[PDB]
């Protein structure tokens, strides 16, 4: 299957517009190469693959019934998570000098998600009876913030790529 297309892919999208390189019509643990390798639950029919930027703390987020920013306001899962997840570093790739703004994550949103929606809006998150009309400032914000990733970040603050391999069996 097209793994070298999906996995070792020079650009990965900010989570706010998470990729779905679904494959079809077509060991990773052993000889260790990656940080988080969890095959939760454990032939497939419809297999789903995803990749986005996160730091090294909040891999915790992407899981059934798990609570916080990249679960809540970016990418949330159901409670019966059958699949394999491959998370691993990308500090030598995702960390330029004096700022890495090539990445983003959704901060401001009224509600969390249900499982597996994508939502990409830059529409100004309504905060007060004072309107926004797109004119931000106070009572009117910009929904996202960038990760601003950079290299000396310790064990907590460095970008780590993720592979989500969710499966659906009709």
């Amino acid at each position: 299957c097209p793994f070298g297309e999906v996995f070792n892919a020079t650009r990965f999208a900010s989570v706010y517009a998470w990729n779905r390189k679904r494959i079809s019509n077509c060991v990773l643990y052993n000889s260790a190469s990656f940080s988080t390798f969890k095959c939760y639950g454990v032939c497939f029919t419809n297999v789903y693959a995803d990749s986005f930027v996160i730091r090294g703390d909040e891999v915790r987020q992407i899981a059934p019934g798990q609570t916080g920013k990249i679960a809540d306001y970016n990418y949330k899962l159901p409670d019966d998570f059958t699949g394999c997840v491959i998370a691993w570093n990308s500090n030598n790739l995702d960390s330029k000098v004096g700022g890495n703004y090539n990445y983003l994550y959704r901060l401001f949103r009224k509600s969390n998600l249900k499982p597996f929606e994508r939502d990409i809006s830059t529409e100004i998150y309504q905060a007060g009876s004072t309107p926004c009309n797109g004119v931000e400032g106070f009572n009117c914000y910009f929904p996202l913030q960038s990760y601003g990733f950079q290299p000396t970040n310790g064990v907590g603050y460095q970008p780590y790529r993720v592979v989500v391999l969710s499966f659906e069996l009709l």
Partner: antibody
Framework: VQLVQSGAEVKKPGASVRVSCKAS????????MHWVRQAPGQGLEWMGW????????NYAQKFQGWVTMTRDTSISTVYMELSRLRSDDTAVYYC??????????????????????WGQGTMITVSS | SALTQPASVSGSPGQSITISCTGT?????????VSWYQQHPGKAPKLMIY???KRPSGVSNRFSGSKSGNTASLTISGLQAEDEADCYC??????????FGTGTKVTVLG
């Protein structure tokens, strides 16, 4: 954590000017990018700001339209245009950094903490 | 769009000075977001006090301030001719904008 503005420029009345503010050594997108005017002898008049994450402007009710703020991600640099220049626009225009980290508990803090290097704008008809 | 300082304040060496920042019940009343900036001639502004009372590192503990009701205060203790500047106050507004005060010249006598 350091900012640097472009250098002093002269324009004949009617023209416009490009004026840049350049970040070094801190995350350029987390914090907002404001800009303030100090004419000779007067106080500091807030003008507007720009979200470095892709777009987004708010102006004060005297600079709207003819002031236009934009940014570019590649070299951590933000830009301000003054259209329809007339003589008493001649001033010193600062860019200001202070802005949108959070509204929460872990992270917060406002109030422009990193100003810049006082980029003059002189408007006159006389030649070099 | 109006936050009111006195144009002029005059203090003796060693003594303390008060520089109020009037703002009625919009941003100085219910919004603890008054901020103070200092400016020497030629130099760019410098952050004196942010967040009503707190101070940013490097700024002398001689500076201080509070905000209650409709008056915000910035108090310089043990004055110095070194401190002589323009001290602007600043708040953000329900109007979503950003607004500086009229500005206050400090002269330090003697």
């Amino acid at each position: 954590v350091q900012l640097v503005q472009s250098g002093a420029e002269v324009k004949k009345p009617g023209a416009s000017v490009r004026v840049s503010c350049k970040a070094s050594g801190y995350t350029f997108t987390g914090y907002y990018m404001h800009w303030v005017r100090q004419a000779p002898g007067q106080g500091l008049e807030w003008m507007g700001w720009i979200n470095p994450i892709s777009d987004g402007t708010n102006y004060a009710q005297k600079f709207q339209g003819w002031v236009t703020m934009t940014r570019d991600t590649s070299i951590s640099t933000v830009y301000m245009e003054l259209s329809r220049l007339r003589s008493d626009d001649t001033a010193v225009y600062y860019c200001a950094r202070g802005g949108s980290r959070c509204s929460g508990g872990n992270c917060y803090g406002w109030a422009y903490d990193a100003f810049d290097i006082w980029g003059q704008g002189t408007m006159i008809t006389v030649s070099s | 769009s109006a936050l009111t300082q006195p144009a002029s304040v005059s203090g003796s060496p060693g003594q303390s000075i008060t520089i109020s920042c009037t703002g009625t019940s919009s941003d100085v009343g219910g919004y603890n977001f008054v901020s103070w900036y200092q400016q020497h001639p030629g130099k760019a502004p410098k952050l004196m006090i942010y967040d009503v009372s707190k101070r940013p590192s490097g700024v002398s503990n001689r500076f201080s301030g509070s905000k209650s009701g409709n008056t915000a205060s910035l108090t310089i203790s043990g004055l110095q001719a070194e401190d002589e500047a323009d001290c602007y106050c600043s708040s953000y507004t329900s109007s979503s904008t950003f607004v500086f005060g009229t500005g206050t010249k400090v002269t330090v006598l003697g």
